[PDB]
Design a protein around this nucleic acid. Structure first.
Ligand code: FES
Ligand SMILES: [K+]
Ligand SMILES: [Mg+2]
Ligand SMILES: [Mg+2]
Ligand SMILES: [Mg+2]
Ligand SMILES: [Mg+2]
Lengths: 97, 122, 111, 137, 32, 86, 78, 100, 97, 50
RNA sequence: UUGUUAGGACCUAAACUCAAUAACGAAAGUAAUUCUAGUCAUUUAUAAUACACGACAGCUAAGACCCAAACUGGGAUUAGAUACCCCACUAUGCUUAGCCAUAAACCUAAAUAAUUAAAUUUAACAAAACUAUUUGCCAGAGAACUACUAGCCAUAGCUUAAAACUCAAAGGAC
């Protein structure tokens, strides 16, 4: 499902068309701004441990939330049990990985 | 066709060996052959003890005779040479030069996936 | 038997038309390239070529039904000679009966 | 300038001599190690019998006749008869793959004979005689 | 496929198994 | 029987180390497969069983070699944790 | 997926086969880095613009031009 | 504004061609004991061992020389529909780069 | 459209396939010196293609030449002739530890 | 052209074929000069004639 | 009798390594070497009441006989084994002429030309799925690889193959 976005194969290494990235990134950044404008909750999520501290530092700088640790089963589908009766779930989840 | 004879002869002195190679090559001609070349490979020790005509042999003279003959003559030639008392072991084969070394690009990798499906499925 | 059997002095099909052009060739060289110093397969390529000329209007074409039928008559007569010596060869006995059946099928389409 | 595992080549000249004897002359110790009995015979290089022994001749019987210690005793016994006859160096041709294959060679060493080489002549047919049927147990 | 694929009588079996395993361990057949 | 005696399957004893010579001769006769041949040739193995075994041995080797390859492909990644604490 | 092969690659392949990689080390952090091979391909192109049609002529002439520049090209068959 | 196609054609990584047995300059960014994580400008970093000679010289930020082998270590194993990647590159550390 | 777009072509940097030691070399039953390089010094047994390193074609060529030589009184069967023990080592086999 | 050359080569080669007239003389030349078909290859695939 | 024999005879039977190979043949089947003969073009699928073949085992006649070996005999075993184990030996495995036509003869996959998308595990396990074409075959289970009929160097056989009867299951994968 990624072959649409691949510019080609440079000697075994797939290259990503940066023109499709620019269009898609424009849409994603615009969407992320309107959600933040409306005071929605944004949660950054990644399991890459090299960038765990960077992503937690980014979320703190933005004013948003980060979950870079082991993700518990039911965190979103069973939030009321895990967090409390009136827990407000995120309005947007950004998957850096 | 073109046949390569491999004639192991009894270890003898040159006078008698030359007589053995004249009698042999004459037989090829008597069977309708056209002898092309005669080569010697030297006297040496046999790889094992060959027993011919009620005598055990440990040393023999190796010779090659390149020749042409009809396909029907190959059988008669070997039959006649087997009755000669100075012939340890005659073997006629098709001449190697008539067969030409094939051309190869290299070793093409065969995948392991296609080696286990063969071994199991059949 | 058949009316025509290639002579032993005939050249093989590769050099059949080349040796005549050469001005002078030795008797030995002619004997090496004759049908005497060739396999039975070579003698059959000469039998087939003779039949194609004597029957087919265009002997250059070998894909016509008449040419394919001629190719199978040479094989059939070859297998019959084989089976006269190898009386218990069951693989070639199958080859003989399958060529006969193939010829009959082609003769039907030709008709 | 190194030792060669490969034996000397018969019909050539070599610098290896044992007790003023060439390789072709050193007597031969024929060990037939079967799964029941281990026999031993020592012969001169002209094929003349000098010593003979086996687990049976030592006095072992039935199952004990086919152990490691039984062949060791047979080797020591073969050495003693050979040592009396005038043998110091032996070429060990060990046929068979039984329990006393090695022990018979160890007994010969303990008995005062010096092994210079170890050959193997276990029969291996190249296609031969149909072996007996597998035992159902 | 491959990944999925991968009294008197006891006296006779006890003695013979011993008689055979001793031979397997007297050579490198199992391992060096 | 017709060949020359003492050339085939013959090792030479170095400095009276008669055990070392024997232990090398066994490694030779085993690497060449004579040991397995002599063992199996004691009783008749029927052609149908011979093919089933040789097929199983081939497939077993291929599986072990690939599993060994994977264990060695990740041999380098087994190192101290660079991102300890995160 | 299209294999990405530019026309310079024909020249670059010959350069690596004849001289290997330039003894100077590639610096992939400099966005405008010019390697020994990239200068070879720039000169090879310049000569080809003049109209030389023989590949052998363009390959040996480019080596001479770089030699004048002072670049150390070793024709390492090993 | 230059197009992406132009950027790729003239990119240093495109000029390198095949990365086997090539020479590149890397930078140490992370050190764990005697293991050096070196960025050579590619997608994945490599991990080398601190050489016995001049070990103290290999500190963070130190530019070094490398001989690339693979840009990514990946291999397909029996019963796998995709390649297994360790998210790492292969290179041989040759030594420090002379500042000059 | 774009001059910088990639051009279809066969891989310039393609690496030549790996040949065997006997690739494009005649294998004759009378060249017992070459034949002896693929048998065992002690038993004389033919080595497999995982030891000789030959391809399928040349492995069969050597096999047919050894058997013909052994059957025609040129080569021994139960060992390697001592006169070829000095020749180079081509087979990946170490009897000594 | 190829077949004409092959015929001409064979005719040139046929000059040196053995016959009843030169049999004894050719036998002695062969005996005087032994031939060797032996040669060996290295791990690099290089012939090593001795 | 045994061991050894770089002693003689014999040429019975079977073909180590190669073979970690996957070739050939319609299937059965086929791998010691050499030589001879030899596989090949029908567009393709589709055939019996015809023709030709058909592992192993078995019969007929004359040979062969190294070894193996139903069976038979002797020795052990056990509360007793016609068993499993040991020894001896036979039909037989081999050859040359005739017959027998049977295997889980199964890759348990009919033979062909497609496609890899139909937002298709379309039960589950096997071997990803599916379409088109032609023939053969199947229609709950036992009765039944049976009875009878017919064909056949077969004569307890082989192929073809029911009914009464009795039940509400039989059967498959997990
Ligand atoms: S790789 Fe070419 S013949 Fe072996
Ligand atoms: K009994
Ligand atoms: Mg026989
Ligand atoms: Mg032929
Ligand atoms: Mg009998
Ligand atoms: Mg009826």
């Amino acid at each position: 499902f990624m072959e649409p976005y691949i510019f080609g194969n440079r000697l075994g290494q797939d290259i990503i068309d940066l023109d499709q990235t620019a269009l898609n990134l424009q849409l994603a950044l615009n969407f992320t701004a309107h959600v933040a404008y409306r005071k929605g909750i944004i949660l950054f999520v990644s399991r890459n441990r090299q960038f765990s501290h960077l992503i937690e530092t980014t979320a703190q700088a933005c004013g948003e939330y980060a979950h870079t640790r082991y993700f518990k089963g039911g965190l979103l589908t069973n939030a009321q049990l895990l967090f409390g009766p009136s827990v407000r779930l995120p309005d947007l989840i950004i998957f850096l990985h | 066709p073109r046949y390569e004879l491999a004639l192991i002869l009894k270890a003898m002195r040159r006078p008698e060996t030359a007589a053995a190679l004249k009698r042999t090559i004459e037989s090829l001609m008597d069977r309708g052959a056209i002898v092309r070349n005669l080569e010697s490979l030297g006297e040496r020790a046999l790889p094992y003890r060959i027993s011919s005509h009620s005598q055990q042999h440990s040393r023999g003279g190796y010779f090659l005779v390149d020749f042409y003959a009809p396909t029907s003559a190959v059988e008669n030639i070997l039959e006649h040479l087997a009755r000669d008392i100075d012939v340890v072991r005659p073997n006629i084969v098709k001449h190697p030069l008539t067969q030409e070394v094939k051309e190869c690009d290299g070793i093409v990798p065969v995948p392991l996936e296609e080696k286990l499906y063969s071994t199991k499925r059949r | 038997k058949q009316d025509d059997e290639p002579p032993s002095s005939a050249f093989i099909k590769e050099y059949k038309d080349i040796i005549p052009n050469i001005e002078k060739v030795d008797d030995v060289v002619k004997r090496i390239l004759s049908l005497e110093m060739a396999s039975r397969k070579e003698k059959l390529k000469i039998k087939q070529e003779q039949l194609m000329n004597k029957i087919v209007e265009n002997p250059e074409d070998s894909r016509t039904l008449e040419a394919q039928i001629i190719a199978l008559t040479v094989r059939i007569r070859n297998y019959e000679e084989h089976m006269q010596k190898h009386r218990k060869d069951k693989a070639h006995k199958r080859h003989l009966l399958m060529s006969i059946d193939r010829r009959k099928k082609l003769l039907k389409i030709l008709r | 300038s190194r030792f060669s595992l490969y034996p000397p080549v018969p019909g050539q000249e070599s610098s290896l001599q044992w007790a003023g004897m060439k390789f072709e002359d050193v007597p031969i110790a024929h060990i037939k190690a079967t799964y029941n009995n281990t026999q031993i015979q020592v012969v001169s290089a002209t094929n003349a019998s000098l010593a003979r022994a086996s687990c049976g001749t030592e006095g072992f019987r039935n199952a004990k006749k086919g152990t490691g210690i039984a062949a060791q005793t047979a080797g020591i016994a073969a050495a003693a008869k050979a040592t009396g006859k005038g043998v110091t160096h032996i070429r060990v041709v060990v046929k068979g793959m039984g329990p006393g294959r090695w022990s018979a060679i160890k007994g010969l060493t303990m008995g005062g004979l010096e092994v210079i080489s170890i050959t193997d002549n276990t029969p291996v047919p190249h296609x031969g005689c149909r072996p007996r049927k597998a035992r159902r147990l | 496929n491959l990944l999925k694929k991968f009294s008197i009588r006891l006296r006779v079996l006890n003695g013979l198994l011993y008689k055979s395993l001793t031979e397997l361990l007297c050579t490198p057949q199992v391992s060096q | 029987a017709k060949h020359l005696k003492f050339i085939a399957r013959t090792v030479m004893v170095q400095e009276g180390n008669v055990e070392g010579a024997y232990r090398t001769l066994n490694r030779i006769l085993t690497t060449d497969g004579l040991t397995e041949v002599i063992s199996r040739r004691r009783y008749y193995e029927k052609p149908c069983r011979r093919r089933q075994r040789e097929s199983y041995e081939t497939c077993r080797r291929i599986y072990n070699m690939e599993m060994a390859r994977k264990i060695n492909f990740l041999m380098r990644k087994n190192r101290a944790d660079p991102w300890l604490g995160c | 997926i299209q294999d990405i092969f530019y026309q310079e690659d024909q020249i670059r392949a010959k350069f690596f086969a004849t001289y290997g990689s330039g003894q100077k080390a590639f610096d992939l952090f400099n966005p405008n880095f010019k390697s020994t091979c990239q200068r070879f391909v720039e000169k090879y192109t310049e000569l080809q613009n003049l109209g030389e049609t023989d590949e052998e002529k363009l390959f040996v002439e480019t080596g001479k031009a770089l030699l004048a520049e002072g670049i150390i090209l070793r024709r390492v068959r090993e | 504004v230059e197009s992406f196609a132009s950027m790729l054609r003239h990119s240093p990584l495109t000029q390198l061609g095949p990365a086997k047995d090539k020479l590149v300059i890397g930078r140490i960014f992370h050190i764990v004991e005697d293991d050096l994580y070196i960025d050579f400008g590619g997608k994945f970093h490599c991990v080398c061992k601190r050489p016995d000679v001049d070990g103290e010289k290999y500190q963070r930020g130190t530019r070094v020389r490398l001989r690339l082998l693979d840009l990514e270590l990946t291999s397909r194993f029996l019963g796998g529909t995709t390649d297994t990647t360790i998210l790492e590159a292969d290179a041989v550390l040759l030594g420090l780069q002379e500042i000059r | 459209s774009n001059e910088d777009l990639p051009v279809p072509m066969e891989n310039p940097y393609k690496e030549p396939l790996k040949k065997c030691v006997l690739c494009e070399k005649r294998v004759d039953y009378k060249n017992v010196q070459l034949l002896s390089q693929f048998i065992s010094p002690f038993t004389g047994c033919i080595y497999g293609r995982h030891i000789t390193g030959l391809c399928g074609k040349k492995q069969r060529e050597i096999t047919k030449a050894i058997k013909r030589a052994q059957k025609m009184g040129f080569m021994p069967v139960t060992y390697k002739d001592p006169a070829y023990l000095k020749d180079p080592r081509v087979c990946n086999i170490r009897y000594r530890e | 052209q190829l077949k004409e050359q092959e015929v001409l080569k064979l005719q040139e080669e046929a000059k040196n074929f053995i016959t009843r007239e030169n049999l004894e003389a050719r036998i002695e030349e062969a005996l005087d000069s032994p031939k060797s078909y032996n040669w060996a290859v290295t791990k690099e695939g290089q012939v090593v004639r001795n």
